[PDB]
């Protein structure tokens with residue numbers, strides 16, 4: 001049976017990026033829908049669970065994407081709710097690539113740390129977006145003491161609360177309104193992630209290269225000026241004075257490989273659920 | 288040349304269900320359109336009749352779907368009207384599974400009845416959707432005395448009028464607003480079909496198991512709660528007292544075989560027409 | 575990798591015609607979008623240039639189509655504006671088949687004329703549509719003195735101005751309101767094209783057969799009444815006395831082969847740009 005991926009995008013039309021990577025992940029056919037909502041996705045899921053039986057079931061799978069993670073999560077939960085008993089197919093959530101990017105970034109940092117981040121302070125600057133929040137969740141699941149930072153405490157605390165509830169972790173929040181406050185927030189940190197919006201610097205070179213406690217820095221912004229000063233986006237563990245740096249393009253190379261590999265896994269069973277935790281498990285295998 | 292199926296759906300987006308079965312029926316590519324109307328389908332058909340010649344003409348075909356039986360009929364007629372001379376491709380109509388599902392269910396019931404239902408009362412509860420309307424049509428063509436029931440008389444009468452004109456039969460409409468009236472409507476019936484929307488019970492045990500006239504019951508709803516109480520969805524002629532029951536999965540297995548078979552046939556010539564008459568003929572050969 | 579074509583259509587839905595020809599040109603997968611604008615295409619293009627690298631880049635390509643050429647050109651320009659350095663894929667513009675049809679027609683006429691039309695008068699009747707405008711452009715590039723005609727001088731001059739700006743040529747414009755005026759306009763012409771809307775006659779038999787200078791006539795309208803009287807739509811260089819005729823079906827046959835061949839070329843490099851000039855160069859090789 002041919003491997004059929006059904007792409008449910010919350011934006012008006014389905015992401016081209018997700019189509020290419022889906023085909024390179026081994027889907028034989030990709031059929032995409034835009035404007036997917038919790039109310040209309042049920043009948044789409046019916047088409048995946050009532051059309052094939054037994055051995056053939058695993059050859060259909062669902063990918064949920066779009067530009068708004070909370071909208072994607074609402075659809076993803078509606079997909080899982082529609083399943084019952086054996087009437088189910090594997091599914092994946094990766095709105096805007098936030099799951100695969102966060103998983104690649106954290107997996108790379110944890111590996112470079114020696115395999116454990118337990119008990120150590122990790123700071124996520126501008127952590128209030130989807131990539132920062134998923135990064136915070138995975139770091140916290142690994143035992144790091146995570147501080148999720150943003151320009152406003154109310155928004156940072158809201159992000160921490162959301163991560164904490166979904167992932168049953170205990171991320172804390174902090175307000176860092178400017179470069180000075182971001183530079184203070186990383187003092188004593190062992191791992192620093194910059195998860196700011198595209199094209200913005202958050203942590204100048206002098207604010208991390210002289211902090212003895214910092215082991216690893218990682219930056220998800222690929223567009224100059226980079227989130228972290230004094231690195232190149234292609235850096236993938238490059239040493240700077242006994243610290244190691246992961247730039248956005250180095251992280252993004254793993255993300256692509258990981259995203260493709262997740263797609264392939266969807267067709268190996270009818271029971272996969274690929275959200276942050278399961279995507280991160282594979283990221284650690286591949287990093 | 289590759290086998291190209293063009294899916295013209297009257298709903299806002301194309302049915303996922305129909306994509307899967309089209310691929311499993313042997314299409315090499317499926318390209319789906321929503322919001323198809325009699326007025327806009329002509330240009331779509333032009334794309335299928337002016338792009339290939341000779342032996343390759345048959346490698347493109349048209350599938351018409353959606354959730355409104357009358358609208359699907361009008362689009363399908365507009366497709367046939369666009370053809371002229373040898374400029375045509377094979378086409379199939381199966382809005383909401385109407386033809387392939389009704390053909391499977393009616394063929395199985397007629398077979399279990401000994402090969403004839405002529406002159407006997409058949410009641411289609413919630414028969415105003417595509418599946419109920421084609422069920423009423425095929426039963427009436429077998430000479431059954433058909434009552435097509437719905438919560439409102441005007442919608443039930445419009446469905447009956449549509450059936451009667453299309454098939455040159457005389458189905459009667461009835462208003463059954465609730466459980467009590469549905470139970471009354473099946474009194475004296477020999478065959479009862481439940482064609483209600485997904486996940487609704489229409490006919491509990493007490494409303495059919497004590498009506499001596501009832502020979503066979505058939506339920507199209509696969510999602511619990513099932514349309515008929517006291518049966519299993521996998522039932523395929525299972526005996527309950529002196530009666531036999533067909534559940535949605537027992538019917539559905541044949542519907543899927545029928546649907547896949549018709550898809551493959553679309554690519555074996557450029558002149559096929561697959562509607563109730565042809566699909567029911569095939570169902571009786573395979574049931 | 576699999577050859578992925580991304581079809582960007584300016585109409586509400588993607589052309590069926592372009593889907594069939596795209597597959598017959600060798601695309602492994604076609605993913606179609608409607609309602610594409612200069613504003614929204616950038617994100618689509620990003621999906622084609624950030625998902626594959628190295629030799630795989632050329633296995634993704636873009637096709638822009640739709641019924642409004644000016645709209646397609648605006649989208650095509652926005653696609654090209656998104657490329658920088660090596661971050662690009664091959665792209666083609668063929669809204670409503672106007673580039674491939676005009677390229678086929680002009681290539682056949684120039685070939686039949688002996689390979690040169692320089693200095694000779696060419697008249698494009700009803701030349702204000704996309705096929706007529708592209709035909710005028712390509713004839714002028716060959717050195718013909720081109721007169722682009724229509725029922726209203728302002729519209730004809732606007733078409734010539736558009737052609738002249740885009741192709742750096744000097745097409746002129748004339749108003750021909752009726753048969754008698756079109757008959758006067760072809761006097762002295764060596765090549766006459768009718769690019770009128772479907773199902774309209776523009777040039778009666780007597781208006782061309784008695785004009786000594788006319789060498790070749792070509793008509794793009796395949797639906798009777800044909801654009802040119804006294805010929806058959808299947809004519810492909812058929813001799814009428816000392817003149818030759820190309821009917822719409824002779825031209826259309828080459829257009830189909832040319833269109834398929836252009837698609838194949840899109841996957842042979844990541845740098846192809848198939849607009850009228852490059853499409854015409856291939857049309858001349860294939861004529």
Ligand SMILES: NC(=O)c1ccc[n+]([C@@H]2O[C@H](COP(=O)([O-])OP(=O)(O)OC[C@H]3O[C@@H](n4cnc5c(N)ncnc54)[C@H](OP(=O)(O)O)[C@@H]3O)[C@@H](O)[C@H]2O)c1
Pocket residue numbers: 096097098101126127128129130131132149150151152155156195196197198199200220221222248251252255
């Ligand atoms: N390589 C890939 O595959 C890929 C995939 C997805 C994302 N990314 C990248 O990952 C990064 C994060 O993505 P995202 O979607 O999570 O980011 P985002 O939501 O766009 O922005 C993240 C946060 O940045 C902060 N921010 C915005 N403007 C700011 C400004 N002027 N000054 C300071 N802070 C500002 C905000 O936090 P506060 O308001 O709380 O201060 C915001 O919540 C981006 O650079 C994106 O390009 C890469």
Ligand SMILES: NC(=O)c1ccc[n+]([C@@H]2O[C@H](COP(=O)([O-])OP(=O)(O)OC[C@H]3O[C@@H](n4cnc5c(N)ncnc54)[C@H](OP(=O)(O)O)[C@@H]3O)[C@@H](O)[C@H]2O)c1
Pocket residue numbers: 354383384385388413414415416417418419420436437438439442443482483484485486487506507508509534535536538539540542
């Ligand atoms: N076994 C298979 O192979 C297979 C394949 C295809 C479809 N199906 C199933 O077959 C059934 C019928 O298909 P369909 O397309 O005809 O369904 P449908 O159009 O979705 O709905 C059928 C009818 O159900 C009635 N209805 C809706 N809500 C109701 C409610 N609360 N209470 C009572 N009646 C209600 C309506 O009739 P009124 O408004 O007139 O009362 C409606 O016209 C569905 O359950 C579908 O999932 C099964």
Ligand SMILES: NC(=O)c1ccc[n+]([C@@H]2O[C@H](COP(=O)([O-])OP(=O)(O)OC[C@H]3O[C@@H](n4cnc5c(N)ncnc54)[C@H](OP(=O)(O)O)[C@@H]3O)[C@@H](O)[C@H]2O)c1
Pocket residue numbers: 670671672675700701702703704705706723724725726729730769770771772773774794795796822825826829
């Ligand atoms: N073989 C193929 O694959 C293929 C592909 C594309 C197109 N074509 C054919 O090529 C031809 C031209 O296509 P097109 O899209 O460029 O055409 P078009 O835009 O529809 O029409 C061309 C011009 O015809 C003139 N016209 C319209 N109605 C008229 C009327 N009643 N009387 C006189 N003139 C009238 C108009 O010029 P004025 O208003 O300025 O007078 C108009 O700009 C069509 O016949 C089309 O079918 C064939």
